[PDB]
């Protein structure tokens with residue numbers, strides 16, 4: 186028994202060394218090279234595992250049903266089942282055999298070639314054939330390509346057919362002028378250490394028509410990932426990059442010669458889009474005759490993925506932001522279909538996937554507006570647009586009388602002196618303010634007073650009916666919305682600030698469109714939906730239907746009233762219920778305060794669409810409302 190337990194331990198140490206990819210340590214646990222002992226020395230056992238397991242990308246060795254018994258007084262036999270992962274999938278239930286040598290107080294393994302794979306003898310060989318899987322496509326709600334595989338025209342220069350002095354310098358300036366290239370970039374490209382004078386040095390992927398080709402400039406045709414919307418959907422779709430040795434070490438089933446999603450939906454749906462590698466892993470004898478097929482299956486191309494996105498609305502929403510910082514989310518609020526998820530500024534996903542220079546990537550990374558941010562998935566304070574929610578909560582618990590008229594003097598208000606120098610600020614000095622007037626003029630003082638009168642307890646009861654703290658079932662990385670940092674405000678100022686969408690509220694644009702959908706579903710919250718085939722989810726009785734029938738007519742006046750904050754949208758001549766908003770943010774880079782401009786809008790007649798747009802750190806005289814006319818026209822025409 187004491188020798189049987191020692192034999193079991195050494196087999197477990199041998200498997201563990203192979204499991205951890207430490208082949209040299211596993212070889213040192215073997216007996217000496219002999220006839221009935223080990224078949225090879227330690228160095229060539231190391232080389233056999235390193236060569237064979239490396240060729241099949243063997244990762245992770247797990248065994249089961251280990252049995253060590255006694256044959257002779259010096260040799261103990263062992264057997265166990267085992268499984269491992271390869272570049273062609275999991276290789277399950279492998280029956281391994283062998284014997285253990287016992288001399289002195291050391292138990293070693295009589296190594297044989299059948300310890301690499303179960304049925305190998307002597308000079309048997311291992312072969313691996315693989316067929317690469319074609320990557321699936323990402324399409325919109327009408328089948329338009331968002332991420333597809335196309336034929337790209339690659340511009341390149343052959344430094345041999347270029348020149349020497351006057352001919353070389355003139356041709357480089359001609360190519361740089363005819364293809365929007367820097368003369369220093371072309372010289373740096375052909376001066377790389379890998380370049381030979383007769384080689385084809387690729388420069389960039391050209392899109393559209395091809396101009397004249399000067400001496401040396403030649404166009405070759407290559408296949409690669411292509412994004413038709415470009416930067417208009419770069420944060421949502423993402424990009425693919427070359428698979429690295431580090432990627433294979435983490436997942437050997439990846440194609441060692443293919444692409445992998447690095448961000449966005451390309452990464453979130455990488456498994457479904459990449460498919461499975463097809464091929465065969467077989468064992469042959471010394472004559473190359475097939476002895477045993479270990480793994481074999483055909484190639485399975487990646488499956489397509491259809492989104493709720495409207496490719497026309499996505500491009501319209503992104504273009505409307507004019508390159509400024511901000512985001513826009515468009516939905517069909519009755520089903521939750523995400524028609525558009527625009528984030529601005531953005532980056533070029535085609536440039537990312539077709540090789541980007543360290544300078545262009547550095548410009549993206551050091552842009553203070555940060556184009557890499559997915560602003561539709563980043564939490565923000567919702568701004569004074571949130572007065573809709575506080576009003577609906579106040580109507581439900583009876584704390585807000587729609588006809589009660591408050592008397593507000595000036596633009597600043599304080600509960601008492603305990604607030605110190607802080608005051609809630611409004612933009613319009615209206616003396617007699619009821620609920621309808623407060624929504625039309627966006628009166629933060631009114632709602633701050635109604636929030637304080639309502640109380641934190643009743644306020645949170647209405648807030649808890651929404652989606653605060655919930656994880657949305659979406660293939661987009663995001664954090665749950667929050668009311669504040671803790672379960673209690675512990676501050677009348679924080680309570681009042683939360684009443685009009687400031688405070689410690691953090692809600693991303695997608696979560697905002699979810700909460701605001703109650704006004705298009707008579708108080709029912711409809712969860713947003715990105716995958717077209719998925720089922721509509723909703724949440725009943727978030728706010729009362731009476732509150733909806735009270736607030737939506739007021740939201741019509743935000744557009745139709747001459748002093749409504751969204752009156753410029755009345756020029757469209759379409760039925761609109763809207764609510765503008767602002768959020769004041771303090772920053773340390775600039776001692777002056779920044780603000781975000783918000784716009785909520787939907788069709789109150791048919792509930793066909795709904796949009797939530799925001800400008801982050803807006804320039805002076807800029808707003809989300811002045812940029813929404815084109816998207817509102819398109820959504821109203823095509824979504825009823």
Ligand code: NA
Pocket residue numbers: 563564664665691
């Ligand atoms: Na967050």
Ligand code: NA
Pocket residue numbers: 669670671673674689
């Ligand atoms: Na707090």
Ligand code: NA
Pocket residue numbers: 569627750765766767
């Ligand atoms: Na406003």
